[PDB]
Symmetry: C2
Subunit: 160 residues, 2 copies
């Protein structure tokens, strides 16, 4: 017995999350990234998160080529960035402010309140996606109200 | 206990808010087990598969591994007490919430959850002291409700 895809979409839509832009570099050195809601903590020993990226995506290809990626947590002013990095716009990085970290990884310096640089420590394919484990290597974090996505809409963390 | 490094990582991940589920199963002797879970993540639509990340040695992970199935109970904004009890030290948590047994046997938190998804374990991946559990969704029931949220070390309600 297996549920239908629409019922599953409706279920998962009702689990709201923060919003990241996951970034890396492709083999040509070109920044790549996507809006990502699948950031999940895996373990503290060593500090490891995971993301789940669509197979064939430019971002997964860059993550695999660089074996590292940055997780840029968006604050409430970052809705436009989240739209850019989930939509059909070309040259997404020309539409946001960004800087290259010491690692070379793209950091969204205006739209994110925190950025974690991760080394790819393993992957696991599941259907048409790949779970990517990231061992966190460097963190820069400031105060900010997190952007949220849930029930097919953007919102803001409701507490000061 | 945590190291300084691990604390910086907790500070980061705390700023990625999520909905809140209670993941339930039965142990080998039929006893209901469950825990508060913020690691619910969508993996793929083909077939519909989510994942959760459960601590190794937890009663819930042992039950999930025994029975190869589990329920994901998404809590609505009246469910804070259930989330607190299912994240605390008391093994008699099931006597402190109102619940019902699904036809399959899985525990359903009927008073505190607005949705329940019954899952078959389709794979696992150990990562440090945790196990990522892949759940192929077999059945979903859902009603309207405002999702409970957790972020920045606080409960809140979805604001829209
Ligand atoms: C709130 C939210 C959360 C999301 N979370 C996740 C998640 O956790 N995991 C995940 O895998 N995806 C997620 N997505 C979807 C993801 O952000 C988009 O699919 C994104 O476009 C992928 O970017 P990419 O460059 O890696 O992929 P590609 O599909 O390889 O796109 C490459 C480039 O082509 C352009 N492009 C974008 N979309 C299209 C299109 N439809 N047709 C043609 N060209 C296009 C853009 O310039 C893009 O950079 C999420 C989307 C939203 C809105
Ligand atoms: C907001 C929030 C989100 C969380 N998200 C996650 C998550 O995504 N993943 C995760 O792994 N944890 C998560 N936790 C932690 C998790 O909810 C707690 O660790 C929870 O108490 C685990 O329950 P358990 O019964 O499976 O674990 P256990 O630690 O096995 O048991 C809890 C208590 O019951 C006792 N006990 C266990 N089994 C038995 C038995 N057979 N007989 C007698 N006593 C027994 C234990 O000694 C302990 O005192 C989260 C906590 C919070 C607050
Ligand atoms: N690839 C992914 O993991 C995700 C992709 N998206 C995509 O973003 C767009 C908008 O999403 P919503 O506004 O939430 O409406 P929606 O109704 O399409 O999706 C609801 C929820 O279902 C899950 N989901 C949807 N498509 C998925 C996919 N292809 N793979 C895995 N899980 C998926 C996610 O939890 C998503 O938030 C859609 O194109 C959706 O596919 C959104 C979230 C996760
Ligand atoms: N085991 C898990 O995956 C999780 C466990 N918890 C438990 O609840 C407690 C309180 O959490 P918060 O109030 O958010 O404050 P916190 O500062 O203790 O934790 C902040 C965040 O760090 C991550 N994290 C913490 N402990 C973790 C662990 N053992 N494994 C993986 N990721 C972990 C989670 O994303 C958590 O929300 C944590 O200290 C922990 O015991 C909470 C979230 C997930």
């Amino acid at each position: 017995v297996t549920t239908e895809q629409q019922h599953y979409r409706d279920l998962m839509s009702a689990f709201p999350t923060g919003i990241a832009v996951v970034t890396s570099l492709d083999a040509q050195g070109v920044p790549r990234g996507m809006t990502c809601s699948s950031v999940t903590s895996a373990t503290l020993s060593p500090p490891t998160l995971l993301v789940c990226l669509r197979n064939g995506s430019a971002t997964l290809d860059a993550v695999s080529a660089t074996r590292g990626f940055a997780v840029n947590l968006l604050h409430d002013g970052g809705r436009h960035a989240a739209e850019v990095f989930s939509g059909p716009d070309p040259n997404r990085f020309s539409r946001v402010q960004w800087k290259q970290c010491r690692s070379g990884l793209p950091w969204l310096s205006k739209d994110a309140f925190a950025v974690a640089e991760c080394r790819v420590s393993g992957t696991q394919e599941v259907g048409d996606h790949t779970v990517v484990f990231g061992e966190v290597a460097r963190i820069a974090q400031t105060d900010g109200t997190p952007l949220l996505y849930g029930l097919r809409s953007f919102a803001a963390w409701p507490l000061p």
